Amino acid sequence: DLRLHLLLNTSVTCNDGSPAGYYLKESRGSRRWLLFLEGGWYCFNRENCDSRYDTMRRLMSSRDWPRTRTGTGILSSQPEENPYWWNANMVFIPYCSSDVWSGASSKSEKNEYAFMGALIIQEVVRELLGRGLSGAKVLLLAGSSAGGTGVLLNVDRVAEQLEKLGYPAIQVRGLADSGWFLDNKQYRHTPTEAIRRGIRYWNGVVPERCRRQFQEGEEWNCFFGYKVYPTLRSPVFVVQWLFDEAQLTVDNVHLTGQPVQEGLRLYIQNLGRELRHTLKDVPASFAPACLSHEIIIRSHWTDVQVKGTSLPRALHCWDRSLHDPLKGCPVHLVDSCPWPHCNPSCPTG
């Protein structure tokens, strides 16, 4: 179990002004620290955020958070469930800012909600330094879905923060799961505009080099992995289902069970091909040909394999690669088969 700590800096808040926080399970014998960013979509205007506050309030407020959370998947402390980092210090950072971890705006006379995701990450890091993070060798910033995009948006800022605080020995790395989206055409008209609106509403911030490339008004581009990733300095391992359910949802694709006809077949095959293409120059990546969403905190995350290598193994090979290609220890694992579940190890249900 990971135990809740609300932030001592109570100016760093969830959407409704309640304190943000983190769940922590320390491992005194380890210099590895895993900080996991929870996902859960986002909201981009008053009306949409008001609706989220009615029925997704734990994603907007700490008032009802439990005192503990069980660590699962990569956050598990059991080697059987987590062959990769079972002995690490484990941190789960609840997503309560609804801003894809990009916001830096407080609740105020003019703002019904606070959007402080980027500040939450930095405040968590600062408060952890006194609880052992100061002695870390590796800080792995991981996250799923909106948290995976949050990794891409924040990993270099965490690195810069620790450098400026005087901890140059801590190696900051990223693990972005299910946060690598395509700004593609929908299958039918009903994602780019939502982020453009959100950035303004949240006072959202993006990594500096990416911001300098795209410039004012175009920072929404930095929420798309294939555009922001090449600008990043920190090592980032990208985990992405080729047929991610959230991608298909934003693309207005709903697979019932009737025979898929040619237009949709071509659409789905093209989506997988495009995703594969965007990963070709990502040296640390795990991209199975499955219709699914998220993996790293699922208890059965050990089961999927690409080219016979599981994700925990690929992450271990990545660790080895960052010591100083490895025989039988691959780090770039992208399926080439073109249809969901052409990989036999894909999740079932």
Candidates 74, 100, 210, 297; binder of ligand 657 (CB under 6 A) is: 100
Distance CA 279, CA 241 (A): 11
Residues in contact with ligand 657, total (CB under 6 A)? 12
CB of 38 to ligand 657, least distance (A): 12
Distance CA 252, CA 243 (A): 13
Which stretch, 13-21, 143-151, 275-283, 300-308, contacts ligand 657 (CB under 6 A)?
A: 143-151
Distance CA 338, CA 166 (A): 47
Q: How far is CA 257 from CA 128, 260, 293, in A?
A: 48, 8, 19
Give the closest residue to 253 by CA, choosing from 263, 32, 204, 98: 263
145 is catalytic: yes
Residues 122-141 that bind ligand NAG (CB under 6 A): 123
Which one of ligand NAG, ligand 657, none interacts with residue 11, CB within 5 to 8 A by kind? ligand NAG
Residues 30-89 that bind ligand 657 (CB under 6 A): 41
User: CA 204, 176, 159, 217: dihedral to nearest 10 degrees?
Assistant: -30
| Structure tokens given for 7 | 């932030």
Q: Which of 144, 145, 234, 292 is catalytic?
A: 145
Which CB atom, from 37 or from 162, has the smaller least distance to ligand 657? 37
Which CB atom, from 83 or from 174, has the smaller least distance to ligand 657? 174
- Confirm or reject binding of residue 228 to ligand 657 (CB under 6 A): no
Distance CA 284, CA 319 (A): 10
Binding mask 164-193 for ligand 657 (x = CB under 6 A): ---------------x-x---------x--
CB of 108 to ligand NAG, least distance (A): 13
| Structure tokens given for 293 | 């969403």
51 class by beta-carbon count within 10 Å (0-12 exposed, 13-18 middle, 19+ buried): exposed
Give residues in contact with ligand 657 (CB under 6 A). Answer: 41, 100, 145-146, 149, 179, 181, 191, 195, 223-224, 246
Chain residues that interact with ligand NAG, rule: CB under 6 A: 9, 11-12, 119, 123
Indicate which residues carry an active-site annotation: 145, 244, 293
